[PDB]
RNA sequence: CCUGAUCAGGCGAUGUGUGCU
């Protein structure tokens, strides 16, 4: 549900599922063009340093 | 199939002998480049052009990669698994299209890019003009005065440049002065290549005296050796091909009016036409002109030679930087 | 011929054509300085001459327009202000835009 | 450069030597093409 | 001079006042 978890897997790993369709890939590139998501990220589980408890 | 591109291909003033279909494809790529330059998604362009009907279409690309940037033209191999791995790494595989836009801003952008492609075609045809000779003794008239290089205009809109290390040390050129030289290189610079010459070689004076002497063409006399320290001092040894003919008198003209004109080709060369005979002893002794030779020894095994002379002749036979001596040696 | 009040002007970047709308009249409430475009008005200059490159371009697009001058109203050099009001008048026989 | 300015009348030979042509028509400037 | 990419496009007299020195 959150774009960070979508970033936690690479976009190619998202392409390895048939739940993504033809327009869905265009939507993926359209959202990822804004440099916010789907740049092939990796975290430990959820939180980086600024995602700290306070 | 509007047939506007049909007659439009056959204009055909400047690009008839130039590639017509390639110019059509280049203009189509310019128009599609402008069509890319109007939207905000930075997608690469491909125009698809028809020869039989004339009409065309505009396709978008998808540009198979292993990377994520240029994201409207970003693909990969795991996404190619849905294409059953048929895509390979690196390709520009197109998988989209576009339609149309009127757009007077983009119309001006198409005009600018078409002027750029027309300039590219002009440069290509000029390089083709250079390809038909590739280097020759040719004259030009310099027009621009740059630093340590002089730009020359020539006929049929072709141009050249003269390098300063290829030029004389003291003789400085100015616009309105013609210079004839042998061009030897066309190095591909940015936005097309330009002709380059070097009007300092002995080839230049050699061809100048060939164009000067009428006995040089007809084999009445043969040019045995042409040696030049360029601009400064030069000595060339020539003989008559068994005609009992004055080679210096025929290659000199009236009162030096060949060679003193030919020196004007070099820009002030101190040139000496010199005699030559049958054996290398008398030929080298007369190629020691202008001087007096008492005797000359040579070694038949190893090509070494020795001469002796008076001091008033030694000053004339030596030279400043060995120009006469190295001239006779080469 | 007649003159249009359109937004698509040649020879100017996005820096001048940023306050205009899709119709070509500046927004009510927009800080402008000296040297900007308020109303974009282009004219037909007259055909009067055409060259092979524009012949080719006229075959490509099919646009008739095609030799067009600009006569856009611009802020006199130095004044400032915020545009508070815009009045438009049409004579009969002319269509009305979104603005009027 | 010069030393004095001199004024006099003008003979018609001299006036025909100032000119470069004759004017014969009242027409000002062509329309639809802004050329004379 | 100004505007945009070496190219393109933009330079009034009279009269009436009115107000300042």
From Swiss-Prot, chain A:
Post-translational modification: Acetylated on Lys-22 and Lys-23 in the presence of glucose. PatZ controls acetylation of Lys-23 but not of Lys-22.
Span list, region Alpha C-terminal domain (alpha-CTD): 1-54
N6-acetyllysine PTM positions: 22-23
Residue ranges of coiled coil: none
Domain comment, as recorded: The N-terminal domain is essential for RNAP assembly and basal transcription, whereas the C-terminal domain is involved in interaction with transcriptional regulators (such as CRP) and with upstream promoter elements.
Function, in words: DNA-dependent RNA polymerase (RNAP) catalyzes the transcription of DNA into RNA using the four ribonucleoside triphosphates as substrates. This subunit plays an important role in subunit assembly since its dimerization is the first step in the sequential assembly of subunits to form the holoenzyme. Part of the processive rRNA transcription and antitermination complex (rrnTAC). The complex forms an RNA-chaperone ring around the RNA exit tunnel of RNAP. It supports rapid transcription and antitermination of rRNA operons, cotranscriptional rRNA folding, and annealing of distal rRNA regions to allow correct ribosome biogenesis.
Family the entry assigns: Belongs to the RNA polymerase alpha chain family.
Name by which UniProt lists this protein: DNA-directed RNA polymerase subunit alpha
Protein source organism: Escherichia coli (strain K12)
Part of the full-length chain shown: 276 to 329 of 329
UniProtKB/Swiss-Prot annotation, chain B:
Keywords: Cytoplasm, Host-virus interaction, Repeat, Ribosome biogenesis, RNA-binding, Stress response, Transcription, Transcription antitermination, Transcription regulation, Transcription termination
N-terminal domain (NTD) interacts with RNAP: annotated span: 1-137
GO BP of this protein: DNA-templated transcription termination; protein complex oligomerization; regulation of DNA-templated transcription elongation; ribosome biogenesis; transcription antitermination
Domain S1 motif positions: 135-200
Location(s), subcellular: Cytoplasm
Principal location listed in the UniProt entry: cytoplasm
The protein, known as: Transcription termination/antitermination protein NusA
Family statement drawn from the similarity comment of this UniProt entry: Belongs to the NusA family.
Species whose genome carries this gene: Escherichia coli (strain K12)
Domain of life: Bacteria
GO molecular-function term, one example from the UniProt record: nucleotide binding
A cellular-component GO term for this protein: cytosol
Outcome following mutation: residue 181 to D: In nusa11; inability to terminate transcription normally at termination sites
Residues annotated as domain KH: 230-293
Entry remark concerning the domains of this protein: The N-terminal region interacts with RNAP. The central region is composed of 3 RNA binding domains, S1, KH 1 and KH 2. The C-terminal region contains 2 acidic repeats, AR1 and AR2, which bind to protein N from phage lambda during antitermination. AR2 interacts with SuhB and RNAP alpha subunit C-terminal domain (rpoA); AR2 cannot bind to both simultaneously. SuhB, NusG and the alpha-CTD of RNAP all interact with the AR2 domain and can displace the AR2 domain from the SSK domain (S1, KH1 and KH2) of NusA.
Phenotype when the gene is knocked out: Mutants are sensitive to DNA-damaging agents.
Gene: nusA
Intrachain disulfide bonds: none
Swiss-Prot record, chain C:
Known uses: Co-administration of salinamide and rifampicin or salinamide and myxopyronin suppresses the emergence of resistance to both antibiotics.
Modifications made to the protein after synthesis: Acetylated on several lysine residues in the presence of glucose.
Sequence similarity: Belongs to the RNA polymerase beta chain family.
Function: DNA-dependent RNA polymerase (RNAP) catalyzes the transcription of DNA into RNA using the four ribonucleoside triphosphates as substrates.
Subunit structure comment from the entry: The RNAP catalytic core consists of 2 alpha, 1 beta, 1 beta' and 1 omega subunit. When a sigma factor is associated with the core the holoenzyme is formed, which can initiate transcription. The rRNA transcription and antitermination complex (rrnTAC) consists of RNAP, NusA, NusB, NusE (rpsJ), NusG, SubB, ribosomal protein S4, DNA and precursor rRNA; S4 is more flexible than other subunits. In pull-down experiments interacts with CedA. (Microbial infection) Interacts (via flap domain) with Escherichia phage lambda antitermination protein Q; this interaction renders bacterial RNAP resistant to transcription pausing and allows it to read through termination signals.
Name under which the protein is recorded: DNA-directed RNA polymerase subunit beta
Organism (species): Escherichia coli (strain K12)
Upper taxonomic lineage: Bacteria, Pseudomonadati, Pseudomonadota, Gammaproteobacteria, Enterobacterales
UniProtKB/Swiss-Prot annotation, chain D:
Practical uses of the protein: Co-administration of salinamide and rifampicin or salinamide and myxopyronin suppresses the emergence of resistance to both antibiotics.
Post-translational modification as stated in the protein's UniProt record: Acetylated on several lysine residues in the presence of glucose.
Source organism, top-level taxon: Bacteria
Signal peptide (UniProt feature, chain positions): none
Subunit composition and interactions: The RNAP catalytic core consists of 2 alpha, 1 beta, 1 beta' and 1 omega subunit. When a sigma factor is associated with the core the holoenzyme is formed, which can initiate transcription. The rRNA transcription and antitermination complex (rrnTAC) consists of RNAP, NusA, NusB, NusE (rpsJ), NusG, SubB, ribosomal protein S4, DNA and precursor rRNA; S4 is more flexible than other subunits.
Function: DNA-dependent RNA polymerase (RNAP) catalyzes the transcription of DNA into RNA using the four ribonucleoside triphosphates as substrates.
Family that this chain belongs to: Belongs to the RNA polymerase beta' chain family.
Protein name: DNA-directed RNA polymerase subunit beta'
